[PDB]
Amino acid sequence: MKPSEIREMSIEEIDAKIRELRLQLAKERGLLTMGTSLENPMVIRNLRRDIARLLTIKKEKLREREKGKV
Template sequence: MAILRPNEIRDMSIEEMEARLAELRTELARERAVAAAGGSLENPGRVKELKRTIARLLTIMKESQKEGEVDRT
Protein backbone atom coordinates (compact mmCIF):
# COMPACT_ATOMS: atom_id res chain seq x y z
CA MET A 1 0.00 0.00 0.00
CA ALA A 2 1.41 3.36 -1.00
CA ILE A 3 1.87 6.42 1.16
CA LEU A 4 -1.17 8.67 1.21
CA ARG A 5 -0.54 12.33 0.60
CA PRO A 6 -2.74 14.98 2.27
CA ASN A 7 -4.36 15.91 -1.06
CA GLU A 8 -5.34 12.29 -1.68
CA ILE A 9 -6.79 11.95 1.81
CA ARG A 10 -8.82 15.16 1.55
CA ASP A 11 -10.40 13.84 -1.67
CA MET A 12 -11.73 10.77 0.18
CA SER A 13 -15.06 10.50 1.93
CA ILE A 14 -15.16 9.85 5.69
CA GLU A 15 -16.10 6.21 5.07
CA GLU A 16 -13.14 5.73 2.75
CA MET A 17 -10.83 7.32 5.32
CA GLU A 18 -12.10 5.02 8.05
CA ALA A 19 -11.69 1.96 5.83
CA ARG A 20 -8.14 2.95 4.87
CA LEU A 21 -7.34 3.66 8.53
CA ALA A 22 -8.45 0.15 9.49
CA GLU A 23 -6.31 -1.36 6.71
CA LEU A 24 -3.25 0.63 7.77
CA ARG A 25 -3.67 -0.29 11.43
CA THR A 26 -3.96 -3.97 10.49
CA GLU A 27 -0.83 -3.77 8.37
CA LEU A 28 1.04 -1.98 11.17
CA ALA A 29 0.02 -4.68 13.66
CA ARG A 30 1.23 -7.36 11.25
CA GLU A 31 4.60 -5.62 10.79
CA ARG A 32 5.02 -5.20 14.55
CA ALA A 33 4.17 -8.87 15.13
CA VAL A 34 6.83 -9.97 12.66
CA ALA A 35 9.40 -7.72 14.34
CA ALA A 36 8.41 -8.89 17.83
CA ALA A 37 8.73 -12.52 16.81
CA GLY A 38 12.30 -11.87 15.77
CA GLY A 39 11.58 -12.01 12.09
CA SER A 40 13.33 -9.93 9.51
CA LEU A 41 11.29 -7.12 8.03
CA GLU A 42 11.44 -6.66 4.27
CA ASN A 43 11.41 -2.89 4.68
CA PRO A 44 12.20 -1.65 8.21
CA GLY A 45 11.19 1.90 7.26
CA ARG A 46 7.68 0.69 6.51
CA VAL A 47 6.68 0.81 10.21
CA LYS A 48 7.54 4.51 10.41
CA GLU A 49 5.78 5.15 7.11
CA LEU A 50 2.63 3.40 8.35
CA LYS A 51 2.62 5.32 11.63
CA ARG A 52 2.99 8.63 9.79
CA THR A 53 0.22 7.82 7.35
CA ILE A 54 -2.12 6.80 10.20
CA ALA A 55 -1.37 10.08 12.00
CA ARG A 56 -1.94 12.03 8.79
CA LEU A 57 -5.30 10.33 8.26
CA LEU A 58 -6.41 10.96 11.84
CA THR A 59 -5.40 14.62 11.63
CA ILE A 60 -7.31 15.25 8.43
CA MET A 61 -10.34 13.36 9.76
CA LYS A 62 -10.28 15.59 12.86
CA GLU A 63 -9.99 18.69 10.67
CA SER A 64 -12.99 17.67 8.60
CA GLN A 65 -15.03 17.05 11.76
CA LYS A 66 -14.10 20.52 13.05
CA GLU A 67 -15.23 22.11 9.77
CA GLY A 68 -18.65 20.54 10.22
CA GLU A 69 -19.13 22.09 13.65
CA VAL A 70 -20.92 25.41 14.03
CA ASP A 71 -19.14 28.25 15.80
CA ARG A 72 -21.18 28.87 18.96
CA THR A 73 -19.65 32.20 19.97
Protein backbone atom coordinates (compact mmCIF):
# COMPACT_ATOMS: atom_id res chain seq x y z
CA MET A 1 0.00 0.00 0.00
CA LYS A 2 1.04 3.62 -0.38
CA PRO A 3 1.33 6.30 2.33
CA SER A 4 -1.14 8.56 0.50
CA GLU A 5 -3.89 5.94 0.36
CA ILE A 6 -3.14 4.98 3.96
CA ARG A 7 -3.49 8.61 5.06
CA GLU A 8 -6.75 8.84 3.09
CA MET A 9 -8.59 6.62 5.60
CA SER A 10 -9.40 7.04 9.29
CA ILE A 11 -8.17 5.39 12.49
CA GLU A 12 -10.87 2.70 12.63
CA GLU A 13 -10.28 1.67 9.01
CA ILE A 14 -6.53 1.60 9.65
CA ASP A 15 -7.07 -0.66 12.67
CA ALA A 16 -9.31 -3.02 10.69
CA LYS A 17 -6.74 -3.13 7.88
CA ILE A 18 -3.99 -3.90 10.39
CA ARG A 19 -5.97 -6.79 11.87
CA GLU A 20 -6.77 -8.19 8.42
CA LEU A 21 -3.13 -7.96 7.35
CA ARG A 22 -1.93 -9.67 10.54
CA LEU A 23 -4.31 -12.57 9.92
CA GLN A 24 -3.27 -12.75 6.26
CA LEU A 25 0.41 -12.75 7.23
CA ALA A 26 -0.20 -15.63 9.62
CA LYS A 27 -1.99 -17.55 6.86
CA GLU A 28 0.85 -16.98 4.38
CA ARG A 29 3.41 -18.02 6.99
CA GLY A 30 1.51 -21.27 7.43
CA LEU A 31 1.27 -21.85 3.68
CA LEU A 32 5.01 -21.18 3.30
CA THR A 33 5.91 -24.22 5.39
CA MET A 34 2.96 -26.22 4.04
CA GLY A 35 3.41 -25.94 0.27
CA THR A 36 6.39 -25.64 -2.05
CA SER A 37 4.95 -24.05 -5.21
CA LEU A 38 5.01 -20.46 -3.94
CA GLU A 39 4.10 -18.14 -6.80
CA ASN A 40 5.15 -14.99 -4.89
CA PRO A 41 7.88 -15.44 -2.25
CA MET A 42 7.67 -11.73 -1.35
CA VAL A 43 4.15 -11.73 0.13
CA ILE A 44 5.46 -11.97 3.70
CA ARG A 45 7.86 -9.05 3.31
CA ASN A 46 5.26 -6.89 1.57
CA LEU A 47 2.65 -7.60 4.26
CA ARG A 48 5.11 -6.84 7.06
CA ARG A 49 6.06 -3.51 5.51
CA ASP A 50 2.41 -2.55 4.88
CA ILE A 51 1.69 -3.28 8.56
CA ALA A 52 4.64 -1.06 9.52
CA ARG A 53 3.36 1.74 7.28
CA LEU A 54 -0.16 1.49 8.71
CA LEU A 55 1.07 1.61 12.31
CA THR A 56 3.40 4.55 11.60
CA ILE A 57 0.72 6.61 9.85
CA LYS A 58 -1.89 5.82 12.51
CA LYS A 59 0.48 7.01 15.24
CA GLU A 60 1.20 10.14 13.19
CA LYS A 61 -2.54 10.81 12.92
CA LEU A 62 -2.95 10.38 16.68
CA ARG A 63 -0.10 12.83 17.32
CA GLU A 64 -1.62 15.35 14.90
CA ARG A 65 -5.03 15.03 16.56
CA GLU A 66 -3.49 15.59 20.00
CA LYS A 67 -1.55 18.62 18.75
CA GLY A 68 -4.69 20.10 17.21
CA LYS A 69 -6.74 19.47 20.35
CA VAL A 70 -4.10 21.08 22.58
